[PDB]
Amino acid sequence: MDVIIGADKDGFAMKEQVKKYLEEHQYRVADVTPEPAEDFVESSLAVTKKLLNSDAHKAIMFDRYGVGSAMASNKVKGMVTAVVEEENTAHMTAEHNGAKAIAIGTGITGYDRALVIIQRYLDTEYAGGRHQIRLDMLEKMI
Amino acid sequence: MDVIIGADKDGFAMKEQVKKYLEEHQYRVADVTPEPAEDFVESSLAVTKKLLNSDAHKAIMFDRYGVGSAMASNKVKGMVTAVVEEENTAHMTAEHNGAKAIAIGTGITGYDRALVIIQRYLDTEYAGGRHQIRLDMLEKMI
Amino acid sequence: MDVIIGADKDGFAMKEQVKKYLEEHQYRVADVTPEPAEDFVESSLAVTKKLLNSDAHKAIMFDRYGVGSAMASNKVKGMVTAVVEEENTAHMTAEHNGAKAIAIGTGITGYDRALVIIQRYLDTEYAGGRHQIRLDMLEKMI
Amino acid sequence: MDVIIGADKDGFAMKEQVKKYLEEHQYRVADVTPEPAEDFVESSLAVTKKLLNSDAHKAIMFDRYGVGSAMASNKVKGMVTAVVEEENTAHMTAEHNGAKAIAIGTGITGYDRALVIIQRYLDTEYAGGRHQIRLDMLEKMI
Amino acid sequence: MIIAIGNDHIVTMQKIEISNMLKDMGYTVIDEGTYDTHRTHYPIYGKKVAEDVADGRADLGIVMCGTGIGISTAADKNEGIRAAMCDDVTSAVYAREQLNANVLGIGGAVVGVHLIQDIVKAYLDATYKETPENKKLIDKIDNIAKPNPDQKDNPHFFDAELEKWAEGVYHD
Amino acid sequence: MIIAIGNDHIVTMQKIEISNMLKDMGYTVIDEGTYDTHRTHYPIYGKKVAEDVADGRADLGIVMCGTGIGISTAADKNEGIRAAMCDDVTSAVYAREQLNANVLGIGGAVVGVHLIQDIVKAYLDATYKETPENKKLIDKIDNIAKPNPDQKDNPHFFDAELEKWAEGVYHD
Amino acid sequence: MIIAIGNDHIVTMQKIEISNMLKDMGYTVIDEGTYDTHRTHYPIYGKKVAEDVADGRADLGIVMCGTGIGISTAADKNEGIRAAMCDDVTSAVYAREQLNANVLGIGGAVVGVHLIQDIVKAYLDATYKETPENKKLIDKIDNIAKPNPDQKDNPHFFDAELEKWAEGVYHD
Amino acid sequence: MIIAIGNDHIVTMQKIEISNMLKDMGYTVIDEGTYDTHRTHYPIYGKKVAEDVADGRADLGIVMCGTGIGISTAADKNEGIRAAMCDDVTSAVYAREQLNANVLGIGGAVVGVHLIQDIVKAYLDATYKETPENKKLIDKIDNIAKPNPDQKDNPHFFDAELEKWAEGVYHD
Ligand SMILES: O=C(CO)[C@@H](O)[C@@H](O)[C@H](O)COP(=O)(O)O
Ligand SMILES: O=C(CO)[C@@H](O)[C@@H](O)[C@H](O)COP(=O)(O)O
Ligand SMILES: O=C(CO)[C@@H](O)[C@@H](O)[C@H](O)COP(=O)(O)O
Ligand SMILES: O=C(CO)[C@@H](O)[C@@H](O)[C@H](O)COP(=O)(O)O
Numbered sequence A, B, C, D: 001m002d003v004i005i006g007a008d009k010d011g012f013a014m015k016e017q018v019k020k021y022l023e024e025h026q027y028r029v030a031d032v033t034p035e036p037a038e039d040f041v042e043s044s045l046a047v048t049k050k051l052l053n054s055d056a057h058k059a060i061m062f063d064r065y066g067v068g069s070a071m072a073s074n075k076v077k078g079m080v081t082a083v084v085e086e087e088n089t090a091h092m093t094a095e096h097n098g099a100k101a102i103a104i105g106t107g108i109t110g111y112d113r114a115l116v117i118i119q120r121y122l123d124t125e126y127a128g129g130r131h132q133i134r135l136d137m138l139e140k141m142i
Numbered sequence E, F, G, H: 001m002i003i004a005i006g007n008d009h010i011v012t013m014q015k016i017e018i019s020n021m022l023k024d025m026g027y028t029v030i031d032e033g034t035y036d037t038h039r040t041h042y043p044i045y046g047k048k049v050a051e052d053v054a055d056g057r058a059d060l061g062i063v064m065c066g067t068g069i070g071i072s073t074a075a076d077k078n079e080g081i082r083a084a085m086c087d088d089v090t091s092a093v094y095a096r097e098q099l100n101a102n103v104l105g106i107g108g109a110v111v112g113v114h115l116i117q118d119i120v121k122a123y124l125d126a127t128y129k130e131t132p133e134n135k136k137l138i139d140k141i142d143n144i145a146k147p148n149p150d151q152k153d154n155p156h157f158f159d160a161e162l163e164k165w166a167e168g169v170y171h172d
Helices: A012-023 A040-052 A067-073 A087-097 A111-122 A129-140 B012-024 B040-053 B067-073 B087-097 B111-123 B129-140 C012-024 C040-053 C067-073 C087-097 C111-123 C129-140 D012-023 D040-052 D067-073 D087-097 D111-122 D129-140 E009-024 E042-054 E069-076 E089-099 E113-125 E132-142 E159-166 F009-024 F042-054 F069-076 F089-099 F113-125 F132-142 F159-166 G009-024 G042-054 G069-076 G089-099 G113-125 G132-142 G159-166 H009-024 H042-054 H069-076 H089-099 H113-125 H132-142 H159-166
Strands: A002-007 A028-031 A059-063 A081-083 A101-105 B002-007 B028-031 B059-063 B081-083 B101-105 C002-007 C028-031 C059-063 C081-083 C101-105 D002-007 D028-031 D059-063 D081-083 D101-105 E002-007 E028-031 E060-065 E083-085 E103-107 F002-007 F028-031 F060-065 F083-085 F103-107 G002-007 G028-031 G060-065 G083-085 G103-107 H002-007 H028-031 H060-065 H083-085 H103-107
Touching (some): A002 A012, A012 A028, A040 A067, A059 A067, A067 A081, A067 G089, A081 G069, A087 A129, A087 G069, A087 H113, A129 G042, B012 B028, B012 B111, B040 H132, B059 B067, B067 B081, B067 B101, B067 H089, B081 B087, B081 H069, B087 B129, B087 G089, B087 G113, B087 H069, B111 G089, C002 C012, C012 C059, C040 C059, C040 E132, C059 C067, C067 C081, C067 E083, C067 E089, C081 E069, C087 E069, C129 E042, C129 E159, D002 D012, D012 D111, D040 D067, D040 D101, D040 F132, D059 D067, D067 D081, D067 D101, D067 F083, D067 F089, D081 D087, D081 F069, D087 D111, D087 D129, D087 E089, D087 E113, D101 D111, D129 F042, D129 F159, E002 E009, E002 E069, E042 E103, E060 E113, E069 E083, E089 E113, F002 F042, F002 F069, F009 F113, F042 F060, F042 F069, F042 F103, F083 F089, F103 F113, G002 G009, G002 G042, G009 G113, G042 G060, G042 G069, G060 G069, G069 G103, G089 G113, G089 G132, G103 G113, H002 H009, H002 H042, H002 H069, H009 H028, H042 H060, H042 H069, H042 H103, H069 H083, H069 H103, H089 H132
Parallel strands (some): A002 A028, A059 A101, A081 A101, B002 B059, C002 C028, C059 C101, D081 D101, E002 E028, E002 E060, E083 E103, F060 F103, F083 F103, G002 G060, G060 G103, G083 G103, H002 H028, H002 H060, H060 H103, H083 H103
């Protein structure tokens, strides 16, 4: 499986840690920010662009609070980004929302918890079915 | 106000940051672990001893998950330690439990969130009154 | 205390029994239907007129289902009639609604239960206070 | 379908009314109290005896409050009697409890409501299935 | 078919249960009653539901409060409405079949949910059957109240009372 | 005074409301009925409450299920018990004053909580008023069932049915 | 101040608790989210709340669903809105102070009510503190999406999907 | 497997949800915590659950209160218990795998039910894996407290405080 990742100056450290983690676990990673992005708008949009223009369906955005990356990337038509701070949303947003990416705030979530969140997200597939009506509604929006 | 702090190897880095934070905010800090403790049992017990023997009524323990420092320190008669990872418990445990210390897991809670949790804990006083029965019950236990 | 009573052909029998009951319990009763009214609209309106023009603040309407007497009398501006078939509403409608009258359906409610309902209604005074806003609103309607 | 009925002095009047009703609606009625029973213990036990010793699975007991007939008849091993005052229990007790008889209090329930209750009871069959465990438990009791 | 429903804060949970049921049954629901459980006033929602029915926005209405007396009385006090207060199936069926009642009132704190469901279902399943007898009763009922244009379709009708409430006039 | 209370899974929420009320009123409560809302069987809790009263561990008992019929009947089928199934205040007072009923049954899904509270309070406030007439009725009631030592105070009484349930014997 | 609130069926109970709190705090509330717990779709309510804020009918908005992701994302996908998905007090304050977020999203099934109350209060108490730095970030955020006149203030925007749903197009 | 569960009045509803889930999963449940929502004291139930586990009546325990701090601390203060306060899945798994925690504490008013379910499931699914490192940590923890025979298996341990409460000593 493939994973797209990116980060601004605040999330860079954790991004590097997760990158090594994912690579050591047979994951193919596409790092769109080898050097920290100017800010979370640039990093989140970079991850979004690479995702919507690739065959990967999972991505992780890193910044200080998570909120910013999701707020910005969700403005892009067709994008769905979930700020994740706990282990239930980690899988539920993938199952129900088919979240194309999750955003982790390094000033909010500790590293060990981040790894559990990430693994749950990566191990969960979109259920489709009745949930598609909601994804169709979102994609219709700006 | 006085505050007692301690940490093991995993919680040391955050402990050092918080110490700087407390000093900058006019807090008299007693650091029982200038060097990281062998493990969270040693650090949590050191904080407990210093606390139960000092005039301070606030303390912060640091380790990887928080769970351990609380599990160990709560075995001490009269001690009440709250693992805290969100902002409601941060004040409610002080108001209702008169928590003698809080335990923060560095692998669970990010720094910015830890600071808000800590400030809410330090800013809240034990309400006493009806809550005293529960504290009397806890104090009675081993 | 004063009580106004009325009934149509279906509620006449119970009305007569209650009248005897009220007299035996030192109640000054005003019977607006010595003979059964043509229908519940006539009986309920007769009770309403007598009530809104008398010093009494308690009244009981009798018919087959209760629903009709309440539906008709409530059309009168300022009137508040409660269909009652259980013992909680019997007092609550007086306490909160200051119900000017209650309506009992003889085909719905048995005599022994009707007596308990009636005594609870007569024994309860309107609480006023905050409830007055709702009564002012009702009084304002057609 | 067959129906077993009985009543004490207080429920006799309604029993006679229901008897005429049932007969006028193609129902075969077995009246075990052509003359009012001494009390509700005698009438309820008479209905129970005739029921458990017949091929009919529905019965109606009449008394002043309903409670007495059910309290007495339920003491008989294997008997299940439901006091009924409203239209939901009327059918639910048959569906779930397979109530062998319902008890109506003439001082509680008006005639028109009694007929609706009775019809719902008579028109409903025992669902069996998972509910049988509860009926097995009851039959095991004294 | 469209059903308008309303309630005060005491029975919002019961209203939700009935709303859910109505939708499962295929009815379109217009929820007017209060949406949370913050202290409010039953006449407000009774009037809202009554007008939905009277103006043709809804076919029938269902209103509930603790006992149902307050909100059903408020609903009844509107042009074109015949509100029946029914805590039992028997009178609810009578209300529809004989009085062609178009608004059903129920006491959500005195009637259990299973029975509330039965009352609602019975009321809706019932059909008005005109007869010379009930036609005359209905006509009388429809002509008791004197129409007030200032109340009809005026959502600000209770603003004066609401202001007095906000100013603490109605204290205990 | 001590009140034993029990219920099946359909009315656990109503039982909680009554338990709270009883404690606020100064009563000591022994909660036997089910504690959650997982599908279970009313006879189990009806028997537990009945025995608390019959054995002197509680002064009176209150039992509830959807309609109250099942659990009150189960309570009635025990030595020393006179269970009164009452969805109304009137018959509940009669049950206590005339039949000295020591277990009150109520349908938690058919009676609204405000009315349940009223029934309970009325039942508890009422006092048995002995007369040669009702004493004869009560004695007759107390002698209808034949005592079974295998049921009396036997906690494993329903083990047979519970096993069959765990083995899927009672499927739909 | 006016607060618009919305939700899907999974968290209607949590929405009610917050609505009650906001009113006790003196806020005027516009409840848009679903009113019962019948299965519905979060984008509907996210859009309604978003437009209330964007059009000036409400000062700020709060939206909730199971995780909050769906409804907050829907709210974010509207002109004039900056929706912040925050299951914690810390990021909610940051969202208001640095990003001047005007819509707060919370996961009502993953965050306990006491903490939800704390998040809401902290978000509302916080004030946007403009700096050349965050103004640049905000402006960039406000210019990412391309305005679509067909979505803006169009109540029939989702009619297409709703019909397909009524026609069983979205079965499992 | 047998799971003992307890709670104070603030989170009885959440306890019920977890009890239901545990039974659906095939676990046998011993409900000790409070059964209604009448104001009570968390140490009472924390101690009850702790002893069920310590005496072998239950394999593991789960305790909940508003924040979980009070009841989990009470549980921890008993011989043979290692109570872990975990409002998240990550530390709950750590608690079981590394500290062989036998009592799980959760804040029912700060954690949403869906996440509570995930924490419980993760905790139960996890397995203790002994290592020289955690074996030494566990041994230290097990030897911190000094055993008090007067507390062990004494259900009357808090009677003095309960009497003081009944006498109004603990007023606000
Ligand atoms: O039955 C009714 C009205 O018929 C009740 O719903 C109503 O009187 C409410 O109790 C009023 O609310 P509150 O002022 O908080 O007590
Ligand atoms: O009234 C009663 C019993 O008199 C009901 O409480 C009872 O029949 C329950 O409905 C049984 O539960 P379930 O098997 O999940 O349907
Ligand atoms: O978190 C969310 C959306 O972000 C949930 O609220 C949402 O996905 C609902 O679960 C959808 O409802 P249902 O179709 O009955 O499962
Ligand atoms: O989190 C906790 C304890 O850690 C709360 O459950 C507890 O403090 C209760 O609030 C006490 O109850 P009350 O006296 O009615 O406020």
